[PDB]
Amino acid sequence: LAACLCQAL
Amino acid sequence: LAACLCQAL
DSSP states (O other): OHHHHHHHO | OHHHHHHHO
């Protein structure tokens, strides 16, 4: 999930 | 942090 946030950012 | 993207958009 952390990586989904990084994608979003 | 996601709200940063919604501001940008």
